[PDB]
Amino acid sequence: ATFEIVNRCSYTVWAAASKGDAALDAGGRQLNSGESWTINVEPGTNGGKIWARTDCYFDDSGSGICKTGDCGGLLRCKRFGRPPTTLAEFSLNQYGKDYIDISNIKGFNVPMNFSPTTRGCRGVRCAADIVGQCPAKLKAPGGGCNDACTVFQTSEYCCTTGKCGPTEYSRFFKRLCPDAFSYVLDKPTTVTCPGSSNYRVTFCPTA
């Protein structure tokens, strides 16, 4: 599948793409405002994620730090990033279908639209000012709005026992972005698309 990753934000982001134990395509790239990066993701990929990183510094070997979304200090991410990160999530060619969603389970840093560029299903978006409205206890100094599991490490927020309900903190993310997952057991906002669809991820879609 092809994913076009577009930075419509007025600031530079460092896109990242991983399936947790490996990079997708090159795994990461700087996107200045307006830039687009096209990657190719192997069919059948399960559990892929794309996210933005902010305020990064890399040396000539691709090593450094980012204030949000850092993936072990690498420009080309092999691993998932440190919260807070708005996440585009996807599993491709799963019994004939692709499954996409946006998640706030690991917090929010940059607004996002995740839409097919081929026929057959709708896109999803989380474009509210979550960072501006973020509850005080969830604000991340580097930027961004952490999820409650990251901040408080309780069984209820992290849904460790497989039972857990919505919380004051999950409801905040859900109020502002009802089409994104707000906690692990949220009612699914996954979209089913035809297998082998192509997609566009746009950071700051309403910019």
Ligand code: NA
């Ligand atoms: Na998230």
